[PDB]
Design an enzyme around this catalytic site. Structure first.
Site, PDB file in Angstrom:
ATOM      1  N   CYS A 141     -52.706  -0.349 -47.684  1.00 10.91           N
ATOM      2  CA  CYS A 141     -52.253  -0.648 -46.342  1.00 10.91           C
ATOM      3  C   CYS A 141     -53.204  -0.023 -45.322  1.00 10.91           C
ATOM      4  CB  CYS A 141     -50.813  -0.145 -46.147  1.00 10.91           C
ATOM      5  SG  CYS A 141     -50.155  -0.298 -44.454  1.00 10.91           S
ATOM      6  N   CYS A 191     -51.648   2.315 -42.523  1.00 17.26           N
ATOM      7  CA  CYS A 191     -51.057   3.359 -43.338  1.00 17.26           C
ATOM      8  C   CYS A 191     -52.137   4.336 -43.821  1.00 17.26           C
ATOM      9  CB  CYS A 191     -50.388   2.734 -44.543  1.00 17.26           C
ATOM     10  SG  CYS A 191     -49.153   1.450 -44.163  1.00 17.26           S
TER      11      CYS A 191
END
Length: 114
Positions: free
Chosen positions: A40, A43
């Site tokens: 991600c 992230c």
């Protein structure tokens, strides 16, 4: 003198996850968990900051839960937005931050910062 700060415990297994949470509960340690994925983008972008947090807070147990890794765990905790940062105290959940929020995270951190 072993003082290893700046590290977050990355649970790649439920065992480590369980082991740490049980300990955080029992030792009455304040724990902050980041549910995230290494694949991600945002992230991963917010990841160094969470490690930075670990770098100033050795009294706080930080944990990386990778949602690709522990997908069933993430589903039981109901983590759909990535990443979700959960702030607990003494093993008891206080509050969580849903999604990568750069400014607002700081406000949630300051809340706990004392």
């Amino acid at each position: 003198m072993a003082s290893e700060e700046g590290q977050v415990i990355a649970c790649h297994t439920v065992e480590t996850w369980n082991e740490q949470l049980q300990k955080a509960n029992e030792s009455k340690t304040l724990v902050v968990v980041d549910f995230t994925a290494s694949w991600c983008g945002p992230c991963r972008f917010i990841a160094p900051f969470f490690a930075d947090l670990a770098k100033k807070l050795p009294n706080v147990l930080f944990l990386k839960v990778d949602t690709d890794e522990l997908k069933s765990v993430a589903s039981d905790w109901a983590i759909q937005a990535m990443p979700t940062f959960m702030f607990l105290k003494e093993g008891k959940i206080l509050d969580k931050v849903v999604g990568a929020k750069k400014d607002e995270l700081q406000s949630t951190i300051a809340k706990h910062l004392a």
